[PDB]
Structure formats: C-alpha cells, structure tokens
Amino acid sequence: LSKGENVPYTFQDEQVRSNPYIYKNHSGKLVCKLCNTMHMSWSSVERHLGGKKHGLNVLRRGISIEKXXXXXXXXXXXXXXXXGSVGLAIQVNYSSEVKENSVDSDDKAKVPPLIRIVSGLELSDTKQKGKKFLVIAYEPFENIAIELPPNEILFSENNDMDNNNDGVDELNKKCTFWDAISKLYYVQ
Amino acid sequence: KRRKTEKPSLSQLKSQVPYPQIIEWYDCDARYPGLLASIKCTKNVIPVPSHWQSKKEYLSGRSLLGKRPFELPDIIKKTNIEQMRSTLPALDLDYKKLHDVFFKIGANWKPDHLLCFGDVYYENRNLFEETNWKRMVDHKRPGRISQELRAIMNLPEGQLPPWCMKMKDIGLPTGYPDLKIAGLNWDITNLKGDVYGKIIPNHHRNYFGALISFETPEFE
Amino acid sequence: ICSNKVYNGRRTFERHFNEERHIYHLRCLGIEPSSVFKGITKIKEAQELWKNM
Amino acid sequence: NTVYVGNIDPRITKEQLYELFIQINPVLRIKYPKDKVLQAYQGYAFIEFYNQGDAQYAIKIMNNTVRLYDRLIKVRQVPIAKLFIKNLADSIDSDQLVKIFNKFGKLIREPEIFYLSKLKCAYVYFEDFEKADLAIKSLNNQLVANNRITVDYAFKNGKGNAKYGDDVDRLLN
RNA sequence: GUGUAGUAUCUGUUCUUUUCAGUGUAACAACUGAAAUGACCUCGAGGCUC
RNA sequence: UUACUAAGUCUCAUGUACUACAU
User: Fold this and answer.
1) Cα separation of B145 and B159, whole Å?
2) How far is CA D155 from CA A80, D158, D159, in A?
3) A57 is near strand E: CB distance < 7 Å
4) Dihedral (CA of B110, B113, B117, B119) sign
5) Chief localization class (chain D)?
C-alpha cells in the first residue's frame, strides 16, 4: 500500500516527497505534522489523507502561507400652461457663428447645455438665501440662474414610458430641448 | 422552574463580593449564591481546579504525548547507577556512598520547583519549562550575553552591542537605572568576555535559628 | 452591551470578554477595562458596578 | 506593556529571546508560539514587559538594531452612527455625498455605495447620533439630483435604539 | 499455527421532525408530548401582518 | 503580524489490544 515510497523519519533532517507531511517520529508510528495526528498503518494514513480533517488543516496552512469668457447670454422666460397645471419655459439663445469659428476640435463640442437645480444655501458672498435656482451652463458662455420661489411647478409624474438613457439626470432628458442647428436651448 | 428563573444576575451578585472578579457566570445557578460568593471569595480559599465542566477526564492532553519519561535528581544521578544499569532501550555500590548521597550530600537538598500555597496543576501546564524559567531569571542578568546568542548576533568580542549606540542617544534603560555598560557609564577596560556591563547597586542576622553547626547522622 | 449582538457559541461569547470592540464599548462607556467586568451582559448593571469601583 | 516582535528565525529560541531583551528591560512574560503544523517556531514572538514605559523604550532602542541569523529583528507596538440611504441618483458621487453630509455632521469614514435589487444605496458613517438625527430630519424623503432619497438607520435590528443613544453618547464622551 | 462466547480502544463516516411546552442539565446535551394551512413585502434574515 | 485550542454523538468499515471459555 506504500507504493514503495520511502518516508524519512522526522529527526533525519531533510529527493522530493510526494506529500511532505506524513512522517515517522522518533517512534515507529506515522504522523501528520500539520494535523498532529498519529496513525498506526499506512491504510489509516490514507484514510487521514482522504478525510476532511487533514484537508481543513491543509487549507489552514495555505492561509498561513498567504499570511470661460463669462458672457451673459439672452434668456426669454415666459409663463406657460398645459393639461393639468402651470409650468415655466425658458428660451436661451446663443452666438451666431461669431466667435465659435476659432474652436472646433470636437472637445465636448457635441455636449449640449446642461441644467441643474441649486440651493442658495451656498454663494460666493453667503449673505441671504432660502430659494432655488435653475442654473443653465455651456462651456464658453457664462452661467445663468432663475429663481424658483414656488416649492414645486411642472414637476410631472412619469411623463414618458420609463426609457433609461440617464444622459445627465432625469431632469435634463425629461424636459429639455437643444436645437443645435440654430443654437436654441429650450427648458420646461 | 420558578426557582430556576428566580436567580439573581451575576452582576447583582458582584456587589455583595469584595473580590468580584472571581465570581463567574455559572455562580448564578449556585443554590446559595450569596453564601457561595462569600466562601469562594474568602481570603485564603483556593478555587476549584477548572478542569471540571470538561468531559475529557482531565487528561486528554496533547502535551502529555511529549512529556519526558523521567529525570534523576542530580544528587542521585551522582550515585552513578545510571551507568551501572541502563534503563533506556552488578554495578557494585558502596553503602557509605549511597547513605552519604541522601544524608551527607543531600540533607540540605530540595527539589527546585515544588509549588506554592494556591498552585494547582491544570492539564495543559508543564512545570519543567517554568523551572528552566525560574532558574534562568536567576542566572541571566543584563549586561551579559552568552557566547551562543553572541555568535547568532554575530557580535565579535570586545565590541559593544548595537543598542549601546542607540542607548547613547536615548539613554540608559528606564528599568535598569543602576546598569553600567563599558564606554559610557562604565570603564571600557573592564570589558571582559561575555560581560559588557553590570548593574552597580546603590543600596550599600542569624534569624534566631542559626544552627552554627551542621551534623548529619552517620551510617557507621 | 455590544450592539445587542448575536453570538452562536458560549466559548465564543466567553472570548468576547477579551476583545477590541467589547473593551471599546466598556472604556468609551466609562467602564474601565480588564478582568472585573468580564461577566458583563447588559450595559446597566456594570454602571453601578463601576460606581462600586 | 506588550510588544510584538517579528522577522525571527525559528532557530531563535525562548531562552535566547529572554537573554536578548533582559539586556534592554526586565521582561515580565514571553509568549513565543510553537506551531502544531510544523512542530517548531513560526518566527514571531510577544514580549510583555512590566510597563508601557519599558515597552515603548524597548520599541525605540530595539527596533532595527539586533541582527539574529542575518535577519533583522522587528518590533511593533500592539461603534459609530450608520445611516442607510436608498434611491440615490446615478449622478451622485461619493465625494458629493461627503459634501452633503458634512454640513449635518462629521463623517468618521467615507460613504459606501452599493446596488440592491439597480437601486443605488449608501451607508453614511456619522460620529454623532444627534448629527445623524439632523441629517435624518432634514434629508429624509427629499429630492436631490431630481431623485427622491430616503435616509434612515442602517441595520445591525436597525440602529438607533434606546441603548444605542446611551452608549453612542458615551463613545462620543 | 486453533475455536467458542464476550470486552475495550483507534480511525473512517455522518448528521438525524423546521418549531413549541415539560423533565433534565452548571448551561448544554439527552429524554418526554403536539403539530399549519393559506396569502403578501424587502435584502436564508425580517412581520405591534392578516 | 496568525496574538496561541480543537475532537465529540450516529452510521457503516478498517487498526490494535484484551477477558472468560475448549482442544
């Protein structure tokens, strides 16, 4: 059952071993140095190797081994209404190929204007606050804001049928249009 | 049922106790816990050895496999019967020799370890390592380094340890204010062998029972 | 005392008595560490025990 | 008190460690493990001194000093608010979370962004149960980045119990 | 160098009705009795659920 | 830098000793 292999004694001061684990101590018995278990016969040794106990100690031993031009554009606010409530609509116009003739290197040129709702709680001056602003931004031109005293207007409920191209946010895809051919940004 | 659920909390029991840290969770089911806390926490009582509540019959010990068979007390080993009879896998002896070994040589002799008032031997314990420990706290003292650890350290003779330089900037050991070391507080010319320094004590009978003579009973 | 935490063994809970977080709850609670408070379970009782200390 | 020691040759023995460190300070105890999988020494020890003064002293003088078997000897010295927040916007960066919760309370660690169900959720660690109560009071069922977020306590069942205010108060103290 | 009966000890193997109540236990363990069926929600856990 | 603890019960096999009893 030993398959003719020679297992040297533990005290013989270590030829490569099949398993460098099972040894024979000062006595004739066979032992697993990791498991610290004594085994009478080579059959018992093979039961030990095929047993889950030895394997667990092998995994434990492996774990031990591992151990900006700012130019104000022109806005055109206008009180709108549909059905069934009231909403706001803004018409922002941009340059007429006047200065955009020097910059055309596909650097976010494909990116349309972006809007975000900002709380006045944070300002460069920090004096008064308590209302929101519908900020609109484009790379070269300067940012623009619109005060929204009303807690909620035109804040709709599942307008479209839940299609998921987040773009920037639900606000932008939900209610903005960018006439890039004429350079007119509508928001409502 | 009701008596089992009537039990006070162990922390409620701690307050009654002058030495609360001995009481343990199982003392809650003590049938007389207020009394058992007083007895167990009384001055000189020695708590029950804790090998109870284990089913291992007090010795399953893995350490028991590796215990030495026996070692003769060196005084008896002097008697040379070790060589006369080989116990490991006729020797004529003298009556005066053996008798003197027990009496003349071995009257004052006593085992080195023994144990103390409350020493109790738990399964995993082995006294021998603590014997070499106590003996070692005796022999080994700071300022001296054996030649073996010196060779492993690779420190040649006449050269100070590497912590003498960091000890020059940091200062003498807080634990050893009286320690002296060659080259710093102590004369480098007195550097000899394995001792690079020694503690200099700044401190500088009959016990009513002094026998003043020692006479053992003679066999002859 | 620990997050009303659950333990699956009594040996393990007996090991909780010496632990980083358990001692953090004690010491940060104002109940100083080590061996007098070992048998603690609820936060309340060891407070009067620490007043006894 | 107790010092860790490492990068030790298994041929270094217990008496050799003792004789080594007694040169530095008095040594109360030495725990020097002995492997039950290799029947030798795993090459790191623990030396408990009589106080953290001698401990720290030995840490200073001993570190990177003694050379044993050509290998150098190393010496090294040896509970907060958590809010679950659900339905976050995909445009919400972890740093943006940091900015949002800083105004309410100091964060002991950084938020943890994870996805349930698709559903963006995060764990936010506050140093104070009361500041956590502030971020809850103001930020519960609120619309940020055009998305309604829910702010409550994370499970442990959930944080915020009566003993939780009591002990978290103490950990603050 | 055998047979009858019987014993002890390794090792391998494996986890027995989900729960409740009683006995029991230092606590376990173990033993003794019964039995939900249906619907729903979030990530095997959870329900002042019906 | 890993801060020191695992087997138990059952089942069906193997390992090894042993106790009365007969040629």
Assistant:
1) 12
2) 46, 4, 6
3) no
4) negative
5) nucleus
Question: Is residue C15 within 8 angstroms of chain D, CB to CB?
Answer: no
The experimental method behind these coordinates is: cryo-EM
Asked if D118 reaches chain A (Cβ–Cβ under 8 Å), the answer is no
Per the CB < 8 A criterion, the answer to whether B49 and B69 are in contact is no
A89 DSSP β-pair partners: A78
B206 touches chain D (CB under 8 A): no
Residues in B closer than 8 angstroms to D67, CB to CB, are 153-154, 162
Residues of A in contact with D145 (CB under 8 A): 169
Q: CA-CA distance, D157 to D162, in Å (whole number)? A: 12
| CA gap C52, A15 in Å, rounded | 68
Q: Are D37 and A57 in contact (CB under 8 A)?
A: yes
> For residue A166, how many other CB atoms are within 10 A of its CB?
11
Residue B148's Cβ-side half-sphere holds a number of Cα atoms within 13 Å equal to 7
Strand order in the sheet with D119-126: D112-116, D119-126, D81-86, D147-153, D142-144
Phi, psi angles (nearest 5°) of residue D150: -115, 130
Angstrom distance (rounded) from CA A123 to CA C26: 45
Residues whose CB is less than 8 angstroms from the CB of residue D4 and which lie 6 or more positions away in sequence, other chains included: D44, D46, D75, D76, D77, D78
Residue D35 · residue D13 · CB < 8 Å: no
Q: With contacts defined as CB-CB under 8 Å, which chain B residues touch C45?
A: 9, 11-12
Check whether residue A53 has its CB closer than 7 Å to nucleic acid strand E.
yes
Alpha-carbon gap, residue B183 to B206, rounded angstroms = 41
Alpha helices in chain C (DSSP H): 10-16, 20-29, 45-52
Segment B171-174 long-range contacts (CB within 8 Å, at least 24 positions apart): B173/B142, B173/D24, B173/D25, B173/D54, B173/D57, B173/D61, B174/D25, B174/D53, B174/D54, B174/D57
Query: What is the spatial distance, in angstroms and rounded to an integer, between the CA atom of B67 and the C1' atom of F18?
Result: 27
Instruction: Read off φ and ψ for residue B101, nearest 5 degrees.
Output: -60, -45
Whether the CB of A67 is less than 7 Å away from nucleic strand E comes out as: no
User: Considering all CA atoms of chain B, what is the largest pairwise distance in Å, rounded to the nearest integer?
Assistant: 82
Q: What is the DSSP letter of B8?
A: P
Question: How far, CA to CA in Å, does D62 sit from each of B2, B57, B100, B162?
Answer: 61, 45, 51, 9
Q: Cα(D63)–Cα(D52) distance, rounded to whole angstroms?
A: 15
The DSSP 8-state label assigned to residue B198 in this structure reads E
